[PDB]
């Protein structure tokens, strides 16, 4: 009784890989599928060793290991489009490493992932990342403010946003994050009340609001 025969009729929904530790690794695409697989193993239908894995869990585990042995490495995300040959994106500016060091890092990652034959390290540009973030916000015509820090960029999107805006923003943010992760660029969405509706006011260098005839409010 092979494992593929136990996962279902939809054969290609899942992918089975052999691990050097003598254990089978089932690759899933999402949480629902992950639990569909895990139920089979937890029921104990299969007698050999097996494990279920997915991209988000593996990204978390590897980041926890890097936190301990490489606490100063600047990197983005690991892609598992081809689970036998993952791709690891490092920052070109915020790291200095020699080729020897990169190779050693490669081999240690390969030792953490017993189902991968090799790990390809690629250097990416921060300016590109930041630029694609700003271009996407402009293309969506959202209002925003940009703040630059030594190690990161923050976009603040705050105000009386509309439903259509909230929807567009959510879709965009979720698209970007799945590519670049959340380490270098951060987005902050902040709904707040409207003070101007139905009030007279002066705007520009010397603005103030008329709370009512006879009452002047000066903002900061």
């Amino acid at each position: 009784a092979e494992l593929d025969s136990l996962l279902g009729q939809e054969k290609e929904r899942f992918q089975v890989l052999p691990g050097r530790d003598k254990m089978l690794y089932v690759a899933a695409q999402n949480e629902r599928d992950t639990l569909w697989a895990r139920q089979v193993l937890a029921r104990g239908d299969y007698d050999k060793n097996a494990r279920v894995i997915n991209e988000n869990e593996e990204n978390k585990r590897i980041s926890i290991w890097l936190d301990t042995y490489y606490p100063q490495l600047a990197y983005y995300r690991i892609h598992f489009d081809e689970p036998r040959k993952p791709v690891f994106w490092l920052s070109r500016q915020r790291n200095t490493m020699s080729k020897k060091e990169l190779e050693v890092l490669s081999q240690k990652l390969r030792a953490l992932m017993p189902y991968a034959d090799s790990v390809n390290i690629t250097l990416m540009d921060d300016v590109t990342a930041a630029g694609q973030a700003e271009a996407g916000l402009k293309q969506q015509a959202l209002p925003y403010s940009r703040r630059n820090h030594k190690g990161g960029v923050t976009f603040v999107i705050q105000g009386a946003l509309d439903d259509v805006e909230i929807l567009r923003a959510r879709q965009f943010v979720d698209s970007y994050y799945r590519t670049w992760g959340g380490r270098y660029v951060q987005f902050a969405i902040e709904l707040k009340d409207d003070w101007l509706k139905g009030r007279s006011f002066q705007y520009g260098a010397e603005g103030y609001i008329k709370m009512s005839p006879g009452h002047w409010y000066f903002p900061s």
Partner: protein, 183 residues
């Protein structure tokens, strides 16, 4: 087989079965008539089925509508009760209308009740409306919010586009293949 639940209604049994099937748990529904429906599972799956019944708080409670609190059979009614029944019937008729639009699978609608005011010598506040809806896959949600807002705006004497909230979501992946039987 171990008994999970007894004395269910039809809709409750079918909701429980749907949730178990989604997690790969094969379940059985039995009808005892005046005693209702019973749900049973195999021992290897009992533990998991218990954990999911907890997590989803099954069986579902019945659906709540405001007209239930002011039964019309009463011998006396205040204006407040009558006004409440009225609003609680308009909300239902609007959800029944939205479900007929192209692509909508279901919707829910809420109105601002201001019947808690006595309206004694006092101006009426404006109306506020909120809606949720689920769409078929491959629908441009952004371009569909407009239609809903347009349709709702004219159903009341005084509503501003600013006062209408609309939240849309897509249907999840279809559960078509049957779960595997324990070995």
């Amino acid at each position: 087989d171990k008994d999970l639940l007894k004395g269910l209604d039809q809709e409750q049994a079918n909701e429980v079965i749907a949730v178990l099937q989604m997690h790969n748990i094969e379940a059985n529904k039995i009808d005892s008539g005046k005693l209702g429906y019973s749900i049973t599972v195999a021992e290897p799956d009992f533990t998991a089925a218990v954990y999911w019944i907890k997590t989803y708080q099954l069986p579902p409670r019945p659906r709540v509508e405001i007209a239930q609190m002011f039964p019309a059979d009463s011998l006396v009614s205040s204006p407040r009760a009558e006004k409440a029944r009225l609003y609680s019937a308009i909300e239902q008729r609007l959800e029944q209308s939205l479900q007929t639009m192209e692509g909508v699978l279901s919707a829910r609608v809420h109105i601002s009740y201001d019947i808690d005011a006595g309206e004694n010598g006092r101006p009426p506040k404006p109306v506020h409306l909120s809606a949720l809806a689920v769409y078929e896959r491959g629908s441009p949600l952004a371009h569909q919010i407009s239609d809903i807002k347009r349709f709702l705006k004219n159903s009341f004497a005084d509503v501003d586009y600013d006062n209408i909230s609309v939240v849309l979501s897509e249907r999840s992946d279809a559960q078509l293949q049957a779960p595997g039987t324990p070995v």
